[PDB]
């Protein structure tokens, strides 16, 4: 696993080989710090190029306790042989998926993990950034319990497409065109909070249809004009009537060993109507989290213009060179 | 490794990449030599979708100028479906690399240029546009047979990523008419231009620069009839905002070139896609009467948009969705 990176960096262990590239825990000979180094050969894979670009722009902009820190990107020399991107970021022991899969967590830890995840969402939205793909495995965690969001490969700046799974995607997002709302992120959190209690995905659909069936199977099938009063889609409203009509299930009655307040906050997130869906801010304020809530320390963010990801706004086809230059430029200032 | 029927004998590796290895093999039963691609696209969304298009377009056609795929391996399980073995008709090299490494007689030029427009014609007649033609998507075999492949950006007629736009038509770049049959003729004209020049005629360094180079030879459009087919205000402003140079006389740029070829070049590399000559009209035109033959030239047959149904659903696709598309296409 070659790494043509500075001498000062002595690799240690390979933490994961992904579709993106490999990530290794290395040491900063000088200060003796332990960092995470990503090697990414993305130039023949357009999709992975943009993803990497997005991620690099976002990580670098924020300076938040719940969003991963990039320490520095290695700069190449010739744009002519630039075929690898090396990113030195903070090393993180595990992620929220792995943790749920091996430990039972006290209501406190859950309060704290969902608290941190909401804190980050607040700053992202406050900044006009929508993650668009929150799931347990994007929430990295440190040995002392720091949760940190990463993987903004699908992020967007507000005002086909591919996903690894739609297990945490919001129904309004699958049923319509409203695929760039702050609400959709708050829906993912609902799901994440659900997994924290159930220790398993709450809506593990196996395909599109089955996903909705699973969702309504719990929150309830939207029927009247007031339920679909956020689904102006004639098609979406048709398709909904092609699914059985269930009543919302009593989450409280079925999961009685779970903190009643969590259940409330959960219900206020898992709501079909994106407009009645609790917002990250109102979420931090919710009872269930009062222990950790402190409004003088829930950063509101600084707006980021759409031009941040200008590419999302032109039709012009992007070429390979184009992508390599956007990343290149990103690296040189 | 090449997990495939032992009825094959692997000769040699022909190349690699992101998609995965591809190599020659003998079909013991007929002693016919073939190429077997080993794609591992399910962790690369965009590649799986490209693969899906290639498999559907190729399996469908039966033209001498479109690559022929003989079979596709049958996976015997969805759970463990991680590769795709395509067995297609071996090809020695590609026009890019031929131009790239030799002077070709005006004869050779017409041969390849005829074959190329031959294929484009059947596809255009079948409502299929390639949308990404260039020298390296033109594969050539021994007895100089030209066959087009790489339909990863094709669409059915009733944004995206590309390696380069050196072959993209100006109107596609400016406007949103990124789906005309015309864009393929423009690409064609760039192949032709390149056959004479022996190098890319419009090697732009970037969006603007590409337009600056194209207009540098064809003339910047400025008149209403020039900008007749350009419905966008924003787009018109753009053109009107670039250096405005008058067309250059091809004859004095391709001097050691067949006067009948230039005329064809000028008929293809035209800004107005409406005026632009078509794949059929190109076969007829003088420079190509030596191979023309209003018989041996299929006009194809319209394919229904549903052939590419997925280009009509705005839902997001998942890994499983993708594995399922290719899977169905292999068994159905």
UniProtKB/Swiss-Prot annotation, chain B:
<keyword id="KW-0131">Cell cycle</keyword>
<dbReference type="GO" id="GO:0043409">
    <property type="term" value="P:negative regulation of MAPK cascade"/>
</dbReference>
<keyword id="KW-0539">Nucleus</keyword>
<dbReference type="InterPro" id="IPR017441">
    <property type="entry name" value="Protein_kinase_ATP_BS"/>
</dbReference>
<dbReference type="GO" id="GO:0043332">
    <property type="term" value="C:mating projection tip"/>
</dbReference>
<dbReference type="GO" id="GO:0004672">
    <property type="term" value="F:protein kinase activity"/>
</dbReference>
<dbReference type="GO" id="GO:0000750">
    <property type="term" value="P:pheromone-dependent signal transduction involved in conjugation with cellular fusion"/>
</dbReference>
<dbReference type="GO" id="GO:0106310">
    <property type="term" value="F:protein serine kinase activity"/>
</dbReference>
<keyword id="KW-0574">Periplasm</keyword>
<keyword id="KW-0963">Cytoplasm</keyword>
<dbReference type="GO" id="GO:0005737">
    <property type="term" value="C:cytoplasm"/>
</dbReference>
<feature type="domain" description="Protein kinase">
    <location>
        <begin position="8"/>
        <end position="288"/>
    </location>
</feature>
<dbReference type="GO" id="GO:0046827">
    <property type="term" value="P:positive regulation of protein export from nucleus"/>
</dbReference>
<keyword id="KW-0184">Conjugation</keyword>
<protein>
    <recommendedName>
        <fullName>Mitogen-activated protein kinase FUS3</fullName>
        <ecNumber>2.7.11.24</ecNumber>
    </recommendedName>
</protein>
<comment type="function">
    <text>Together with closely related KSS1, FUS3 is the final kinase in the signal transduction cascade regulating activation/repression of the mating and filamentation pathways, induced by pheromone and nitrogen/carbon limitation, respectively. Phosphorylated FUS3 activates the mating but suppresses the filamentation pathway, whereas activated KSS1 activates both pathways. Pheromone-activated FUS3 functions by inhibiting the binding of the transcriptional activator STE12 to filamentation specific genes while inducing its binding to and activity at mating specific genes.</text>
</comment>
<feature type="modified residue" description="Phosphothreonine">
    <location>
        <position position="159"/>
    </location>
</feature>
<dbReference type="GO" id="GO:0005634">
    <property type="term" value="C:nucleus"/>
</dbReference>
<dbReference type="GO" id="GO:0005524">
    <property type="term" value="F:ATP binding"/>
</dbReference>
<feature type="modified residue" description="Phosphotyrosine">
    <location>
        <position position="161"/>
    </location>
</feature>
<dbReference type="GO" id="GO:0004674">
    <property type="term" value="F:protein serine/threonine kinase activity"/>
</dbReference>
<dbReference type="GO" id="GO:0035556">
    <property type="term" value="P:intracellular signal transduction"/>
</dbReference>
<dbReference type="GO" id="GO:0042597">
    <property type="term" value="C:periplasmic space"/>
</dbReference>
<dbReference type="GO" id="GO:0071507">
    <property type="term" value="P:pheromone response MAPK cascade"/>
</dbReference>
<keyword id="KW-0832">Ubl conjugation</keyword>
<feature type="active site" description="Proton acceptor">
    <location>
        <position position="132"/>
    </location>
</feature>
<dbReference type="GO" id="GO:0005739">
    <property type="term" value="C:mitochondrion"/>
</dbReference>
<keyword id="KW-0597">Phosphoprotein</keyword>
<keyword id="KW-0418">Kinase</keyword>
<dbReference type="GO" id="GO:0000749">
    <property type="term" value="P:response to pheromone triggering conjugation with cellular fusion"/>
</dbReference>
<keyword id="KW-1017">Isopeptide bond</keyword>
<feature type="short sequence motif" description="TXY">
    <location>
        <begin position="159"/>
        <end position="161"/>
    </location>
</feature>
<dbReference type="GO" id="GO:0001403">
    <property type="term" value="P:invasive growth in response to glucose limitation"/>
</dbReference>
<keyword id="KW-0067">ATP-binding</keyword>
<dbReference type="InterPro" id="IPR003527">
    <property type="entry name" value="MAP_kinase_CS"/>
</dbReference>
<dbReference type="InterPro" id="IPR050117">
    <property type="entry name" value="MAP_kinase"/>
</dbReference>
<dbReference type="InterPro" id="IPR011009">
    <property type="entry name" value="Kinase-like_dom_sf"/>
</dbReference>
<comment type="subunit">
    <text>In the nucleus, FUS3 forms a complex with DIG1, DIG2 and STE12. The interaction of FUS3 with STE12 depends on the presence of both DIG1 and DIG2. STE12 is lost from FUS3/DIG1/DIG2 complex after pheromone treatment. During its activation and phosphorylation, FUS3 forms a membrane-associated complex with the scaffold protein STE5, the MAPKK STE7, the MAPKKK STE11, and the G-protein beta subunit GBB/STE4; interacting directly with STE7 and STE5.</text>
</comment>
<comment type="similarity">
    <text>Belongs to the protein kinase superfamily. CMGC Ser/Thr protein kinase family. MAP kinase subfamily.</text>
</comment>
<keyword id="KW-0132">Cell division</keyword>
<dbReference type="InterPro" id="IPR008271">
    <property type="entry name" value="Ser/Thr_kinase_AS"/>
</dbReference>
<keyword id="KW-0808">Transferase</keyword>
């Amino acid at each position: 696993i070659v790494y043509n990176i500075s001498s000062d960096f002595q690799l240690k262990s390979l933490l994961g080989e992904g579709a993106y590239g490999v990530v290794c825990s290395a040491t900063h000979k000088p200060t003796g710090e332990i960092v995470a180094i990503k090697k990414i050969e993305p130039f023949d894979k357009p999709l992975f190029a943009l993803r990497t670009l997005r991620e690099i722009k976002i990580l670098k902009h924020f300076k938040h306790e719940n969003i991963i820190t990039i320490f520095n990107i290695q700069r190449p020399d010739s744009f002519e042989n630039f075929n690898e991107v090396y990113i030195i970021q903070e090393l993180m022991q595990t992620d929220l998926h792995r943790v749920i899969s091996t430990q039972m967590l006290s209501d406190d830890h859950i309060q704290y993990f969902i608290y941190q995840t909401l804190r980050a969402v607040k700053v992202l939205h406050g900044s006009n950034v929508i993650h668009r793909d929150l799931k347990p495995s994007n929430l990295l965690i440190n040995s002392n319990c720091d949760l940190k969001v990463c993987d903004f490969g699908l992020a967007r700046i507000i005002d086909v497409e591919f996903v690894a799974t739609r297990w945490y995607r919001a129904p309004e997002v699958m049923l319509t065109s409203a695929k760039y709302s702050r609400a959709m992120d708050v829906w993912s959190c609902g799901c994440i909070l659900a997994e924290l209690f159930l220790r398993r995905p709450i809506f593990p659909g196996r395909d599109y249809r089955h996903q909705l069936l699973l969702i309504f199977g719990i929150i309830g099938t939207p029927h009247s004009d007031n339920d679909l009063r956020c689904i102006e889609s004639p098609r979406a409203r048709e398709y909904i009537k092609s699914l059985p009509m269930y009543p919302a299930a009593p989450l409280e009655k079925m999961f009685p060993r779970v903190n009643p307040k969590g259940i409330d906050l959960l219900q206020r997130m898992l709501v079909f109507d994106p407009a009645k869906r609790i917002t990250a801010k109102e979420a931090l304020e919710h009872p269930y989290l009062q222990t950790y809530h402190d409004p003088n320390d829930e950063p509101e963010g600084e707006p980021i213009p759409p031009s941040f990801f200008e590419f999302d706004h032109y039709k012009e086809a992007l070429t390979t060179k184009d992508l390599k230059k956007l990343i290149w430029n990103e690296i040189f200032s």
